[PDB]
Coordinates of C-alpha atoms and ligand atoms in Angstrom, one line a residue:
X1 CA 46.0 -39.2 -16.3
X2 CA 43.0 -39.2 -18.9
X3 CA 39.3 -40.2 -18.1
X4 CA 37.6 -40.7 -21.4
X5 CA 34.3 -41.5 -19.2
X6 CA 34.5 -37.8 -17.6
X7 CA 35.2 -36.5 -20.6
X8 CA 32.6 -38.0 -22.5
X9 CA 29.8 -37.0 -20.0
X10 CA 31.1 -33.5 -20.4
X11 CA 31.2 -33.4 -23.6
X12 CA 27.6 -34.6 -23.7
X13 CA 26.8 -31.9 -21.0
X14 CA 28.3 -29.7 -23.8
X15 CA 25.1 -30.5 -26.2
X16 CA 22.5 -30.2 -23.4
X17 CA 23.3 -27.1 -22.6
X18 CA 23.7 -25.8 -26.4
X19 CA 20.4 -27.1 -26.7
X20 CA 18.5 -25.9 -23.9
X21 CA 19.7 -22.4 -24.8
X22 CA 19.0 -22.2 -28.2
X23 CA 15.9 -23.1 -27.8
X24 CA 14.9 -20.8 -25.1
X25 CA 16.8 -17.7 -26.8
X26 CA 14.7 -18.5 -30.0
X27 CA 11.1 -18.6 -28.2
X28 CA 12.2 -15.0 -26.8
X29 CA 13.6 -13.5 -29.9
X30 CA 10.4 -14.6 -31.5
X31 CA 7.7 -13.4 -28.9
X32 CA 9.7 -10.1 -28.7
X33 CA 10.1 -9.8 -32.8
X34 CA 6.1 -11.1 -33.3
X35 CA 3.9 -9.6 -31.0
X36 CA 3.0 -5.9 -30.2
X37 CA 2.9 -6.6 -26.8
X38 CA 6.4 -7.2 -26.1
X39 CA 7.6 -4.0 -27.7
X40 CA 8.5 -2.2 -24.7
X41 CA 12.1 -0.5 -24.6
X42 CA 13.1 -3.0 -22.0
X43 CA 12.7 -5.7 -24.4
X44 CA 15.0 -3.9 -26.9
X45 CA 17.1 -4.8 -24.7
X46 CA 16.5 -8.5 -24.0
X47 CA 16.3 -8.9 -27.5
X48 CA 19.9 -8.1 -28.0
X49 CA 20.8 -9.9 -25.1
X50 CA 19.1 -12.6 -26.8
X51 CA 20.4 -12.7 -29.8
X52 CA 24.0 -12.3 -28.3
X53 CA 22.4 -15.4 -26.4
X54 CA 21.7 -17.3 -29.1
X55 CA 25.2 -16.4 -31.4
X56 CA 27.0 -18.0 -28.3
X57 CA 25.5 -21.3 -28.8
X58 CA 26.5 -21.8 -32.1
X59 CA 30.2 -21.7 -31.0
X60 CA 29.6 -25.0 -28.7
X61 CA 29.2 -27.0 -31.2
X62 CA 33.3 -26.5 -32.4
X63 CA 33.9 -26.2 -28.9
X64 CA 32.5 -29.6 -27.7
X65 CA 35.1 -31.5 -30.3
X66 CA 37.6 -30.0 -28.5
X67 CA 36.9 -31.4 -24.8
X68 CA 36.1 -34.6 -26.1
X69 CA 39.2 -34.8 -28.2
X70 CA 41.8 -32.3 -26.7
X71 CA 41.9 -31.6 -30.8
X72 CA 41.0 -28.9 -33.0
X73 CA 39.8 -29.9 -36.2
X74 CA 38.6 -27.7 -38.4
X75 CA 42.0 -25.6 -39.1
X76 CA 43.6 -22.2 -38.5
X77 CA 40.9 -20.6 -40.5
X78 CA 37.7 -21.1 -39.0
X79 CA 39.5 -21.3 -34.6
X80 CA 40.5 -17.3 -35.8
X81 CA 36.5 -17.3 -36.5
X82 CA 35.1 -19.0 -33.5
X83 CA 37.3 -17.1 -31.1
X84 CA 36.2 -13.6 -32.7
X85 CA 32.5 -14.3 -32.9
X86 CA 32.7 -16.2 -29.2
X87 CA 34.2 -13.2 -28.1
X88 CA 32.3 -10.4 -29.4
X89 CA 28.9 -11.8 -27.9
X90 CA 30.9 -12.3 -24.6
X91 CA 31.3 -9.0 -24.5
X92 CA 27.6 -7.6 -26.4
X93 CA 26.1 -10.0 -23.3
X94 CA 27.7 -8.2 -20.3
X95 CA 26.8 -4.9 -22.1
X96 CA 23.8 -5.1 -22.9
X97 CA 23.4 -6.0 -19.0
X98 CA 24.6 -3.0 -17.9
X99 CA 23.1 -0.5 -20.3
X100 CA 19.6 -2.1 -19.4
X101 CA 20.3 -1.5 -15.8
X102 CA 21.3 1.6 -16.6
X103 CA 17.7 2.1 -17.6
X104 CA 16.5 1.3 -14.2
X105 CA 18.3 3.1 -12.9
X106 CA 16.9 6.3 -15.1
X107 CA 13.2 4.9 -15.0
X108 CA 13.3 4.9 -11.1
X109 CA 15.3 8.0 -10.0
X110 CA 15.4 9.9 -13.2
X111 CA 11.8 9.4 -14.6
X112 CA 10.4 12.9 -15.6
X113 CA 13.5 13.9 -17.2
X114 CA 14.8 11.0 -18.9
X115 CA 11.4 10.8 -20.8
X116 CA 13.7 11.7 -23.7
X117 CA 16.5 9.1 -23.2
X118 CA 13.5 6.3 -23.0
X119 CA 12.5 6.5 -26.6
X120 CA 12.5 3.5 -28.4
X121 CA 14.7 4.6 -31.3
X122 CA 17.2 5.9 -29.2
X123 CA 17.5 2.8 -27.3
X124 CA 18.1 0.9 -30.9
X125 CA 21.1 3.1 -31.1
X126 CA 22.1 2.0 -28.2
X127 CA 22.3 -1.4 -28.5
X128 CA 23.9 -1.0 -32.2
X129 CA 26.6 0.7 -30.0
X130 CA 27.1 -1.9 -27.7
X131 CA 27.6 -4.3 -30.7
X132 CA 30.5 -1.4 -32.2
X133 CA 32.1 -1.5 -28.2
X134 CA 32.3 -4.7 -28.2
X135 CA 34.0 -5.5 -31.7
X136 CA 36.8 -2.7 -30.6
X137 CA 37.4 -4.5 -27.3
X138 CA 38.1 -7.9 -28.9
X139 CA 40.5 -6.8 -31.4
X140 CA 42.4 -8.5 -29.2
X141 CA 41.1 -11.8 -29.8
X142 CA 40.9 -11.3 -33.5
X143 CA 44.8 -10.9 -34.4
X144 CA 46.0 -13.4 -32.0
X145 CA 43.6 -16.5 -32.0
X146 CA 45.3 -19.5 -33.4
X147 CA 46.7 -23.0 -33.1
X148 CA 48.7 -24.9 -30.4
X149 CA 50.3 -28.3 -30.0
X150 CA 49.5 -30.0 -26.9
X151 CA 50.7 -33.0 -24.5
X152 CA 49.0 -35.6 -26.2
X153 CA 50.2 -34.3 -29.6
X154 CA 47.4 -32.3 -31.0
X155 CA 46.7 -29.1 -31.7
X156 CA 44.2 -26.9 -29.2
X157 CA 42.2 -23.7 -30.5
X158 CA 43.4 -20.6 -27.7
X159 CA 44.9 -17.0 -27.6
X160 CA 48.4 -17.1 -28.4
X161 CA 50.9 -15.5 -26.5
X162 CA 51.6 -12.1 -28.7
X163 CA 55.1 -12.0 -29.1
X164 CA 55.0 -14.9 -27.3
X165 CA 55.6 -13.5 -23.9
X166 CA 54.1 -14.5 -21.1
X167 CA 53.8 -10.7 -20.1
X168 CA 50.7 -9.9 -22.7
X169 CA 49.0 -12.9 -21.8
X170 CA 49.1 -11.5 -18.4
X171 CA 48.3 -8.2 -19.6
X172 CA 44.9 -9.8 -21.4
X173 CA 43.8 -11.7 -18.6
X174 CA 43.2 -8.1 -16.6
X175 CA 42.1 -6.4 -19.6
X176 CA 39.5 -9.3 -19.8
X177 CA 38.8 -9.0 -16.2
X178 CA 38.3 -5.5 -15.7
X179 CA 36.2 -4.9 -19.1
X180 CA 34.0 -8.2 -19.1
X181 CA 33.1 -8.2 -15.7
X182 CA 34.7 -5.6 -12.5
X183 CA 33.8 -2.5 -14.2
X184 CA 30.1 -3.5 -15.3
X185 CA 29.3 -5.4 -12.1
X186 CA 30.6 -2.1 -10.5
X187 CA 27.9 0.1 -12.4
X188 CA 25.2 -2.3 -12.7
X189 CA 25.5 -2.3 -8.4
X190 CA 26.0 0.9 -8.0
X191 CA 23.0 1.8 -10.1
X192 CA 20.6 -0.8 -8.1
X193 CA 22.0 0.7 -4.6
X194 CA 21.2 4.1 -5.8
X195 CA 17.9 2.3 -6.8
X196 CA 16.6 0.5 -3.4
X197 CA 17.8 3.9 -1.3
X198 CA 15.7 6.1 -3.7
X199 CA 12.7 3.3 -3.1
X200 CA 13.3 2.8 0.7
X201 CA 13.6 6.9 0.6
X202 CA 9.8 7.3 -0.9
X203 CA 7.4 6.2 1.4
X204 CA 6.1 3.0 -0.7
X205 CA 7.4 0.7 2.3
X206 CA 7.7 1.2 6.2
X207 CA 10.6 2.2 7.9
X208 CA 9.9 1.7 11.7
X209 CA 9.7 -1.2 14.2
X210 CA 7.3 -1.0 17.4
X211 CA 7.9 -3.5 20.0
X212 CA 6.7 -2.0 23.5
X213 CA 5.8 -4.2 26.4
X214 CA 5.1 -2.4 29.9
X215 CA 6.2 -6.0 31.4
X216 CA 3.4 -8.0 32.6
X217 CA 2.9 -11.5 30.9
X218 CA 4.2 -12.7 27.5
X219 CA 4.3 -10.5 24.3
X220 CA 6.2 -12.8 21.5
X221 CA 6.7 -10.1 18.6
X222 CA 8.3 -11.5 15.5
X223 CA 9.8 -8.5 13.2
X224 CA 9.1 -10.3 10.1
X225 CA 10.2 -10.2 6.4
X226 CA 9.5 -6.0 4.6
X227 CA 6.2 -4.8 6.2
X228 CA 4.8 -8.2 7.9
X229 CA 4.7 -8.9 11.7
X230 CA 3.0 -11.0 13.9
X231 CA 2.2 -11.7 17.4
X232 CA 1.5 -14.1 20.6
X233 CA 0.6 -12.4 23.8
X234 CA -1.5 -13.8 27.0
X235 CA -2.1 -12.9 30.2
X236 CA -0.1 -9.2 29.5
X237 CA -0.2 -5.7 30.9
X238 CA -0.3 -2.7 28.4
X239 CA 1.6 -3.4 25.0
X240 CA 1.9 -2.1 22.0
X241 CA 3.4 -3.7 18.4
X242 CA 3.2 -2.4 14.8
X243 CA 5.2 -1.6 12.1
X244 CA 5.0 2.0 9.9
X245 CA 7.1 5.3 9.9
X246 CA 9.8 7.3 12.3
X247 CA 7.9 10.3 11.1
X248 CA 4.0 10.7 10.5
X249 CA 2.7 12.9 8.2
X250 CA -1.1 13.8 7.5
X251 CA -1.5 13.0 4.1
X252 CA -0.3 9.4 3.9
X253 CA -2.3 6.8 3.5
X254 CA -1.8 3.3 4.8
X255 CA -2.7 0.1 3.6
X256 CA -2.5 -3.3 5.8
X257 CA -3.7 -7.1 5.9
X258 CA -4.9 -8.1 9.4
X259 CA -4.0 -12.1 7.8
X260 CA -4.9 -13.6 11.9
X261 CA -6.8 -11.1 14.0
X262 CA -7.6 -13.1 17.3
X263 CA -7.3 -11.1 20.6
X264 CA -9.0 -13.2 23.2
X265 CA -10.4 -9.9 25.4
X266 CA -9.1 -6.5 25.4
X267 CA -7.0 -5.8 22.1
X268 CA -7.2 -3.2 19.5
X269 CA -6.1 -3.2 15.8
X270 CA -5.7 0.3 14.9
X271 CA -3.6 3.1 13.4
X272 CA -1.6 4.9 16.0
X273 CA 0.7 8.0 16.4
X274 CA 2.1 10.8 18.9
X275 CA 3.1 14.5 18.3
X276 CA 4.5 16.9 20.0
X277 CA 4.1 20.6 20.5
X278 CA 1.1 19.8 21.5
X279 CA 1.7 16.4 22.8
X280 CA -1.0 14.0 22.0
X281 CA -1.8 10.6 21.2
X282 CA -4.1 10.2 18.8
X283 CA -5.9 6.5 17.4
X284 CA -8.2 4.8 14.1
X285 CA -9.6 1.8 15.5
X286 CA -10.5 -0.4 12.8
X287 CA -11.1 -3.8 15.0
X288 CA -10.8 -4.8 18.5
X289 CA -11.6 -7.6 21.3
X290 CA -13.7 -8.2 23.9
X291 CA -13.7 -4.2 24.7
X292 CA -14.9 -1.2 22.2
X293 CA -12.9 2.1 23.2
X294 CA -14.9 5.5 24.1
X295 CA -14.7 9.2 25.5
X296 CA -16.7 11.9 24.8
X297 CA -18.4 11.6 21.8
X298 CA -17.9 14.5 19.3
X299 CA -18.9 13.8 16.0
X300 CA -18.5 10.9 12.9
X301 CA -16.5 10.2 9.8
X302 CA -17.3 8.5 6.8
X303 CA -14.1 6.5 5.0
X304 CA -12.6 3.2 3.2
X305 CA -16.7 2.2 3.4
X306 CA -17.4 2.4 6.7
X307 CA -18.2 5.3 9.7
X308 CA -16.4 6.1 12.5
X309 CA -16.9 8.0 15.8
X310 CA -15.1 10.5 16.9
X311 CA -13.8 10.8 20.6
X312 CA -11.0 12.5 23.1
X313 CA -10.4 11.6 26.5
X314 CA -7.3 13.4 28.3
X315 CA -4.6 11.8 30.3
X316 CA -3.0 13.1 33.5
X317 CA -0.3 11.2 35.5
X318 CA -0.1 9.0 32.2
X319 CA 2.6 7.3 30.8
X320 CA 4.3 9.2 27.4
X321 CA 6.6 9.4 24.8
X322 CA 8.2 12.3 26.7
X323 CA 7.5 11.3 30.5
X324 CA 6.2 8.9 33.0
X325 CA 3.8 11.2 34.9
X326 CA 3.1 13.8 32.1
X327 CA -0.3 15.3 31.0
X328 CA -1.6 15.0 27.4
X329 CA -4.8 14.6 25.6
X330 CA -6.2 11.2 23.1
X331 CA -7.8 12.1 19.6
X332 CA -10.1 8.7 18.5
X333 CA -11.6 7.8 15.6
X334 CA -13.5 4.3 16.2
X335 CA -15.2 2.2 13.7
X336 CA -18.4 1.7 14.5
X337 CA -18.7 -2.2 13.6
X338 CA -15.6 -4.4 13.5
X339 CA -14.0 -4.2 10.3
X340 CA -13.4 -7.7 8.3
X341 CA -10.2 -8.7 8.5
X342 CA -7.7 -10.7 6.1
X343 CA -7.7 -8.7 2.8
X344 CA -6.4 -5.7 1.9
X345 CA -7.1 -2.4 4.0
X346 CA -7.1 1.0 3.5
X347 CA -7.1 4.0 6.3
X348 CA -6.9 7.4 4.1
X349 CA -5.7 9.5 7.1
X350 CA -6.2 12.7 5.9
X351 CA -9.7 12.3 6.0
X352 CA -9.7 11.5 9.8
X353 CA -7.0 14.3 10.3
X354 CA -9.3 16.9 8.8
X355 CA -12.9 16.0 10.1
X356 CA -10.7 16.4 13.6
X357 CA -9.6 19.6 13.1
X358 CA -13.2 20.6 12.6
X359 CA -14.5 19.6 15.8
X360 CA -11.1 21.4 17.6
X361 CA -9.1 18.4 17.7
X362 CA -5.9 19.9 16.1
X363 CA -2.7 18.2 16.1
X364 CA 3.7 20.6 15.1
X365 CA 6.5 18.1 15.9
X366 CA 5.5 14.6 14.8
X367 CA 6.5 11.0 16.0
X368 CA 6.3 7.6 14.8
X369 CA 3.1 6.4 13.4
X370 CA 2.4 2.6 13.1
X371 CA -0.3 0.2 12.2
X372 CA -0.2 -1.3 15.5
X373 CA -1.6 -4.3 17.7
X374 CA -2.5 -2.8 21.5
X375 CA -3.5 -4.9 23.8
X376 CA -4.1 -4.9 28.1
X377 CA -4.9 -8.1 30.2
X378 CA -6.1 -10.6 27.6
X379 CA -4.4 -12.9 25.7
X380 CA -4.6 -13.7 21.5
X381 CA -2.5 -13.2 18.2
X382 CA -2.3 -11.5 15.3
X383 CA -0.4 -11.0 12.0
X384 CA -0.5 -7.6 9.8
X385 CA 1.6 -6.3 6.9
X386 CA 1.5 -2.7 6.4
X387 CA 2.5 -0.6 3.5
X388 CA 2.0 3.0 2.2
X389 CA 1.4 3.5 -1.7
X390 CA 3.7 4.5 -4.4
X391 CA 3.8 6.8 -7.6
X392 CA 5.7 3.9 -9.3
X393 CA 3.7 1.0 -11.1
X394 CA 3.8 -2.8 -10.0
X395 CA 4.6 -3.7 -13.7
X396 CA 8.0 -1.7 -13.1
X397 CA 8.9 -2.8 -9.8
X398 CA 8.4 -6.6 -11.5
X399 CA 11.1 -5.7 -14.5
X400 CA 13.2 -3.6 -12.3
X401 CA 13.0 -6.8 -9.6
X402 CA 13.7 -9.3 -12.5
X403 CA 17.2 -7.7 -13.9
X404 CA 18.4 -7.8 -10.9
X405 CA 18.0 -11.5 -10.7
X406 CA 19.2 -11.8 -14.5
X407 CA 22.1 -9.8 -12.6
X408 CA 22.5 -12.3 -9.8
X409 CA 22.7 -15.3 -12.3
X410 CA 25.3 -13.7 -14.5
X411 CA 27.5 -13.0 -11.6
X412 CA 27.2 -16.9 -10.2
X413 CA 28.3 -18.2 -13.7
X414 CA 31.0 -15.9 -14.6
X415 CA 32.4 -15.6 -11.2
X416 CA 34.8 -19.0 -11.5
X417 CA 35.4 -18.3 -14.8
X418 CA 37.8 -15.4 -14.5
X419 CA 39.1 -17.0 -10.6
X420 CA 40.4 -19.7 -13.0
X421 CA 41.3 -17.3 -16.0
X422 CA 43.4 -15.3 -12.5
X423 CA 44.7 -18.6 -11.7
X424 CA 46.4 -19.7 -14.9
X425 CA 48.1 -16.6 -15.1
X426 CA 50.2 -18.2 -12.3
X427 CA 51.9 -20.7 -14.0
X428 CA 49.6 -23.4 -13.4
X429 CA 50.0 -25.3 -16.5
X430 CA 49.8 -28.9 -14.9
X431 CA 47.1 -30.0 -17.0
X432 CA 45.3 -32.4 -15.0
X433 CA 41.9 -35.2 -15.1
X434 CA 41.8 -33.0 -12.4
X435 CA 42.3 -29.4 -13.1
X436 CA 41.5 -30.0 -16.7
X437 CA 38.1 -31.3 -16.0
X438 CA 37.6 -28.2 -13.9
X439 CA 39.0 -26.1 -16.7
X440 CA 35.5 -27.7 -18.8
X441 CA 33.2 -27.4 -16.5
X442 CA 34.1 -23.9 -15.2
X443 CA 33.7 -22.6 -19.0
X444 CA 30.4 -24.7 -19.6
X445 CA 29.2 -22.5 -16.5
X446 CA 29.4 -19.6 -18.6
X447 CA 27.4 -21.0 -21.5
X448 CA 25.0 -22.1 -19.1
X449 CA 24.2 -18.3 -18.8
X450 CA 22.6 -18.3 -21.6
X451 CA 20.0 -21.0 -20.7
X452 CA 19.2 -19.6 -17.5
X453 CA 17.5 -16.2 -19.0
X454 CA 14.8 -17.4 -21.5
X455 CA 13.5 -19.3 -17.9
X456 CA 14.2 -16.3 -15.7
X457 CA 11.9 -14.2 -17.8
X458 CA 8.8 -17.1 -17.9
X459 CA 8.7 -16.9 -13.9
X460 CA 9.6 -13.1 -13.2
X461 CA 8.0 -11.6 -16.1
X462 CA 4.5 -12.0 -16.7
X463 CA 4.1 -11.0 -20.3
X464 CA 7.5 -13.4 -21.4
X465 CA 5.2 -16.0 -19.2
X466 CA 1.9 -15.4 -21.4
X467 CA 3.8 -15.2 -24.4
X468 CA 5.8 -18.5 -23.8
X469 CA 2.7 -20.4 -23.2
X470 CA 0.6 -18.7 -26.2
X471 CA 3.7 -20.9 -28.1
X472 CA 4.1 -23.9 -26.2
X473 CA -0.1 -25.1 -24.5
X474 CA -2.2 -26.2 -26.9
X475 CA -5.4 -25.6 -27.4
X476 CA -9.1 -26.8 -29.6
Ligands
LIG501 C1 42.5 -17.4 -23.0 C2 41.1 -17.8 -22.7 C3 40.1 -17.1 -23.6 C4 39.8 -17.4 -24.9 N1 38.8 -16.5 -25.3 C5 38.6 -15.7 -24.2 C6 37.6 -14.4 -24.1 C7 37.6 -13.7 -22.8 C8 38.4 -14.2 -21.6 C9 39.3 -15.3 -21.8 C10 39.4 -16.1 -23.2 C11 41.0 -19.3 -23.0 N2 41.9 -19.8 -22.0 C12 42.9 -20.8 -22.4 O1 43.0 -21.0 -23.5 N3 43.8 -21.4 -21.5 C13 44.8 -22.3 -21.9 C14 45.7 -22.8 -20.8 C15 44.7 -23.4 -19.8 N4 45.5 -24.1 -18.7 C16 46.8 -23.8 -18.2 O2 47.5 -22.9 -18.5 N5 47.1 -24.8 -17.2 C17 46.0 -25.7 -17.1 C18 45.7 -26.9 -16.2 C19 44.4 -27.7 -16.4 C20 43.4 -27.2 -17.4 C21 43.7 -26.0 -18.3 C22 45.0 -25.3 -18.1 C23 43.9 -22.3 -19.1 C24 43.8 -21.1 -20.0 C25 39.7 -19.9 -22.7 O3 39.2 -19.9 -21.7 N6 39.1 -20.6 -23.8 C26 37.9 -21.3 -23.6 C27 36.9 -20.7 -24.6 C28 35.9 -19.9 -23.6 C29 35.9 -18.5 -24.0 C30 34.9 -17.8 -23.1 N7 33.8 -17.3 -24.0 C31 38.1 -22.8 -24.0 O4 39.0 -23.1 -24.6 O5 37.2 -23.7 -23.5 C32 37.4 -25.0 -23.8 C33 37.4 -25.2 -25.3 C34 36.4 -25.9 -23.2 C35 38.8 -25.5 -23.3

């Protein structure tokens, strides 16, 4: 009924963990607090979050003596103290959280008129806020931590019962519940839903799937992760695969990676779109097989460092987007060597759109557009990823990305925390090598928060990542 073994390893997994965290929460309060670098209003932020962080690990220490004991010893005094303190950085941590994703939210929807709200000063009254909130919300805590006896005739450090009903520690367990951890995991989600609709919504990432295969032969097409596809053909008819938008526009520009580009005959990597009203079919041939396409020849374009020609030929009896025997006409722009392939690409359409227009190629209802592998009666393989461009810097999709994880974290070590804290409600007190040592190890979890940050930030932020190792490589 007692295994002083498992208890002694969790007490000693106790001290890692107290370790491991304040030393990670230091290194990031210092970078942020020393160098100019890291004073960016995000980092306000982390900064509270890490000194909340930090504050928490100094409890562990009492708290340790406890599971290796099932004892309090330091009296009634300084429990009331460790309970409040424990509790108000809870509570600062979860927050802080959602105010800074609040932030993202603001930075990616709202930008041009929360350029008021993202001031640094305003943010440091925020965060003095969240430190007022939080003090208010454990009240609680504050009047009614004390002593207990025990089983084994000791005394444990909890939350009395107020009145000592078994109603208001009910009561506390869903004000606990709701305010530490449903209501901001509610907005912190619905802020980063409202953020990846607004993204997908802008035209920073495709949107459309092209898989077309007439019939003849093999065309293995693998829709692969965000913009990325690939594929195997040989021995085919007429096929078409590429990835890019359910509606073209002429002003977008589109960027791609031909990472394999190996048709073995007749194959062409190329931009390629219909319209309608009128219906045509137009092409920007970057790269091809065994076979360069033609028609008649009606002028050049310059673009992206290299020159195309320009060509139409005009279909009757030809297969469609709105028939099978329809009539329409092909607008071609063709490079005029094959462009190297596996680095990043550029094709700034409305260039090509334009220099068409001039020589009376003119394109009002458009279709799909997709940076597309074509092939007919050949074999080979390829692999592309395709993207447009965004208003929104790289540095901001990397913090917004990281809080999210920071998000993802918090939500896998606080999650069987409050299952148990639901639990006990329910009359479980059986305490158990069992349920007791589960009782330790699902509370540990949530300390273990606190060390997962500081290394979060050194792999998913880049500045936290030169700043850590400014501290910790050595150099002559
Ligand atoms: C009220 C909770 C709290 C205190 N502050 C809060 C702030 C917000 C939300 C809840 C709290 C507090 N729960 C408790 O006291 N009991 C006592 C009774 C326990 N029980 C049964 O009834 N049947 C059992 C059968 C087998 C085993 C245990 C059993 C479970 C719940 C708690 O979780 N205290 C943690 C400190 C962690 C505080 C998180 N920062 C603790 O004591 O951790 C050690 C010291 C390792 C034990």
């Amino acid at each position: 009924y007692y295994d002083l073994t498992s208890n002694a390893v969790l007490t000693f997994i106790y001290f890692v963990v107290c370790i491991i965290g304040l030393c990670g929460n230091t290194l990031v309060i210092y970078v942020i607090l020393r160098y100019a670098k890291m004073k960016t209003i995000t980092n306000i932020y982390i900064l509270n979050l890490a000194i909340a962080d930090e504050l928490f690990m100094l409890g562990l220490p009492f708290l340790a003596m406890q599971v290796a004991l099932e004892h309090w010893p330091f009296g009634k005094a300084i429990c009331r103290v460790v309970m409040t303190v424990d509790g108000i950085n809870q509570f600062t941590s979860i927050f802080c959280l959602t105010v800074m994703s609040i932030d993202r939210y603001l930075a990616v929807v709202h930008p041009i008129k929360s350029a008021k709200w993202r001031r640094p000063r305003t943010a440091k009254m925020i965060t003095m806020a969240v430190w007022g909130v939080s003090l208010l919300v454990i009240l609680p805590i504050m009047i009614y931590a004390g002593l207990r006896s025990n089983q084994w005739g000791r005394s444990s450090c909890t939350i009395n019962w107020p009145g000592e009903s078994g109603a208001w520690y009910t009561g506390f367990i869903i004000y606990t519940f709701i305010l530490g951890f449903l209501v901001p995991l509610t907005i912190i989600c619905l802020c980063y839903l409202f953020i990846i609709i607004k993204v997908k919504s802008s035209g920073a990432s495709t949107d459309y799937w092209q898989n077309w295969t007439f019939g003849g032969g093999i065309v293995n097409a693998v829709n692969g992760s965000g913009g990325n596809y690939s594929v195997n053909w040989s021995n085919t008819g007429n096929f078409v695969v590429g990835k890019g938008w359910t509606t073209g526009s002429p002003f977008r520009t589109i960027n791609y990676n031909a990472g394999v580009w190996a048709p073995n005959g007749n194959g062409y990597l190329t931009l390629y779109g219909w319209t309608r009203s009128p219906l045509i079919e137009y092409y920007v041939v970057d790269s091809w097989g065994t076979y360069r396409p033609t028609g008649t020849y009606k002028g050049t374009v310059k673009s992206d460092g290299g020159t195309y020609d320009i060509y139409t030929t005009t279909r009757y009896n030809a297969p469609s987007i709105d028939g099978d025997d329809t009539t329409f006409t092909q607008y071609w722009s063709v490079r005029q060597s094959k462009r190297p392939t596996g680095s990043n690409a550029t094709i700034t359409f409305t260039n090509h759109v334009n220099a068409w227009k001039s020589h009376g190629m003119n394109l009002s209802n458009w279709a799909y557009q997709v940076m597309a592998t074509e092939g007919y009666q050949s074999s080979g393989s390829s692999n592309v990823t395709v993207w447009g461009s965004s208003k929104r810097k790289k540095s901001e999709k990397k913090v917004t990305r990281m809080v999210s994880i920071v998000v993802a974290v918090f939500i896998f070590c606080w999650l069987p925390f409050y299952i148990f804290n639901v639990s006990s409600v329910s009359m479980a007190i059986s305490p158990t090598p069992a349920l007791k040592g589960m009782f330790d190890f699902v509370v540990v979890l949530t300390y273990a928060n606190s060390c997962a940050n500081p290394i979060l930030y050194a792999f998913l932020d880049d500045n936290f990542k030169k700043s850590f190792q400014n501290v910790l490589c050595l150099v002559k």
